[PDB]
Each structure stands twice: as structure tokens, then as C-alpha cells.
Write a protein that binds this DNA or RNA. Sequence first.
RNA 1: UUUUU
RNA 2: UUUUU
RNA 3: UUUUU
RNA 4: UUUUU
RNA 5: UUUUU
Lengths: 39, 168, 56, 112, 56
Amino acid sequence: AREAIAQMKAAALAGINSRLFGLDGNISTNSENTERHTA
Amino acid sequence: PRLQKITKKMNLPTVGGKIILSLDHLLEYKPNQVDLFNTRATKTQFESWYSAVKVEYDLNDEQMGVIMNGFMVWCIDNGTSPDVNGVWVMMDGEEQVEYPLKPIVENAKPTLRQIMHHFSDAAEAYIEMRNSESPYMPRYGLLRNLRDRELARYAFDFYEVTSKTPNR
Amino acid sequence: PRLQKITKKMNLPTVGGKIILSLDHLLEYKPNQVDLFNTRATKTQFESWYSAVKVE
Amino acid sequence: YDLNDEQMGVIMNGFMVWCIDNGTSPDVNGVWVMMDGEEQVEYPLKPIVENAKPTLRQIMHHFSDAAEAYIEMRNSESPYMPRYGLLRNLRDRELARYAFDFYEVTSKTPNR
Amino acid sequence: RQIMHHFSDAAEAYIEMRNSESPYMPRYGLLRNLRDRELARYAFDFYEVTSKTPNR
RNA sequence: UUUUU
RNA sequence: UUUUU
RNA sequence: UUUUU
RNA sequence: UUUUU
RNA sequence: UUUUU
């Protein structure tokens, strides 16, 4: 049975790419403006 | 037969034909490495920060150890940058005893993190045991979505690299 | 033989040559984590919100 | 650990058995444990590793004959095998003697 | 640096022995994340190539 | 030499 | 060590 | 040749 | 060196 | 930190 177990564990895991990062929360698509308006 | 690592006959600087500059007394010169960087503040500035803060809270008592400790946990779970405002808080029992926020920052001679690299092993052991009991993770990590529960040890704003860390 | 996680001989802050700042009484300091964030309001503001609404 | 006492012999011994039954690599975290009676008296894990001047196994090749005799007698009574072997599925019960992370080859071993 | 290329063998032997005792690495390396602990010998701002070095 | 969870 | 619906 | 914080 | 909310 | 109708 020691063989058959390892065959199961290996058969049920393939293609799963770990990729320890998820996604970052910090977005900056465009920097902050910091300018004014007048008439 | 035995000898020492450096020898006078090694090639060395030669300003004068006779006199050598690097005096061979280095065999006992072993300062702890981390104390020498630039990314850490001085021994002086850390001291004055600890003295100047005490007046503006006006404690003059050893409750300061609690207040300092009450700061570092909050210093984990939210960012560290000069653009903070509002308040901060530690809790006891079930209430939310708060405090002000300004004088810690503005009476910080270089920037904040430039002081707070001292706290490396303290918070390390802290999240270690809290991870031992229950599955802990800070906010600085959850905001950036790590999958490996194991590397909570290395999630801070303030964390000082050394030659001791692993290559992972 | 048994001991505790933190030890006094751990490397720690050294303002004075003698006195240590982080007093070793942290072995029982286990606040519920979520109560400590900034993204949540305070216990105070939640209370006043519940009181001020009732009048209006 | 701040012991300054000859309990160190027990703690050292309590490490090597655990050092068998799980891997040895710098990427360990958490805790480790020995037991007495029926409880699970645990300890921390960091300072053994980080205060290891070269890497860990580079120290632990000293322990060769100790753990050897250890698993020999435990195999004598009952059918023992570590985890480092069961993770790699040996069929011959007899070669448990040569299953470690740390094991130092010599000119004495057989050719099998 | 145009002055400090003189110091080549001094700092070399220095980090050699400190690496002998304990696992030393400078900041110029840790900022650039080497994996091989062995090549701390060749991590400086100032280091003067010669015909003596190996091809690694 | 390192890299065996 | 994690990852087996 | 300079430019490596 | 700074800049991580 | 804000900004999710």
C-alpha cells in the first residue's frame, strides 16, 4: 500500500502552479495631480 | 607549528618606505556587524527620542515600557510613514483606550523607520508564538496576499536584513 | 526541564547600561487582533452613532 | 536557553531524535518537541539554526554512530523506520541503518 | 574609489576570517541577493581585478 | 563546497 | 512544511 | 575614463 | 540615503 | 488612510 498511496498523491496534483504571491493592493495608474483651478 | 592569519610580510600600503598604516592589531577587532550600518540611527538619537517623548506625555514613570510595547504591535498592523494622522491605540480587557499620534513622529530626528530598525528580534518572536497558537498574519502581508502561511516571520515595514537570514 | 519563550538574555534595547525598556510581561498579552486596526472605527464612535441616531 | 546546568545533555539528545524524523534544512520554522510520559513539552526552534556558523548539517555530521546504534536497538525490538525513508519508500527493512539526512560516509561501509 | 582600489587584499583577508568563524556577508551583497555564501570574498564597491582571479 | 523539510 | 473537495 | 549609497 | 499607511 | 452606488 505504501506504493499505491504515493501514486494517488502524485496523480491528484499536476498543473497547480504555486505562485506564492497573490496580488498587490497598491495601484498607481496615474500619479496624484496636486494642482488648482481658477476662473 | 602555528602562526597567525595576517602577517607583516603581506602586501600593504607604503606611504613611507618604513612606516605602515594599518597597524596589525586587528586579530581582536570583532564588533557586532549590525551596529555599524547607516540604515540604523545612532545610539544618541535613540536615547533622546526616549527622553523627549517622556516629557510630552508627562509620565516620569516606568509605565513607559508598556506604552512603548503598546506602540510596536500597532506599528506592525498598519503602515509606517510620515503621512499618518489621527490617533493610535492599545487595548486592555475589552475597551479601546486611545492616545495621540503627533509627538512620536515630529520629535523623531531622522525619519521613523530609520529609528525603528532596532526592533527586529522582538516582533519576530512575538508573531512566532502567536503563530504557534493560532494562524496569525499581519496587515502588511494580507494587503499583499502571500500564500505561504510560513513566511509571516518576514512581514514588516521595519525589518533589518543581516547575514543570518536564509536565501528564501 | 522547562522554560519560557522569551528570555532576559535575548538581545534587546539598551538605553541605559542597566535598565531595559520592554518589560518581560508579554507572555500574557493576547488581544484579539482585529480590534487593533485603523480601518475600523473606535469603540467610542460606534457608540455615539448608535445614540445620536436614536434621537433623530 | 539560560540553563547553565547539565540538563543540556537531555536537550541535545531530545534534538537528535527529532532531527531524524523530520528534514534538516534552513527553511524550517515553528517549534520542535521531545516528550516525557504522555505530554508534549515543546521548545523554540530559531536559535539553534541562526547561531549555527556554517549550515546545520555541516555541523551535524558528528552524530553518525550515536543515531546508528539508536535505531539499531529500536529495530531489534520492534520494526522501526524513520520518516526520511518512508517518504522515499524502501522495501528492504534491513537498510534502516543508512537512512538519515546526516550520515557521514567512511571507508568502513559495505558496498551495498 | 579611484583612490580606494589600493585596499584589495586587506579587506579580503578581513572578511575571510570573519566568515571562518561566523556566516558573514556585507551589505553590498545582501542588497543584491547572492545565494552562494562562498563568494562573499568578491563583494565590494572597491575591488581591483588582476590576472590572478579564477574564472568564476 | 552549497541545494535533501 | 504547505497544495489532495 | 567617469556613473555602483 | 530617501519614497512601503 | 481616503476613492467601490
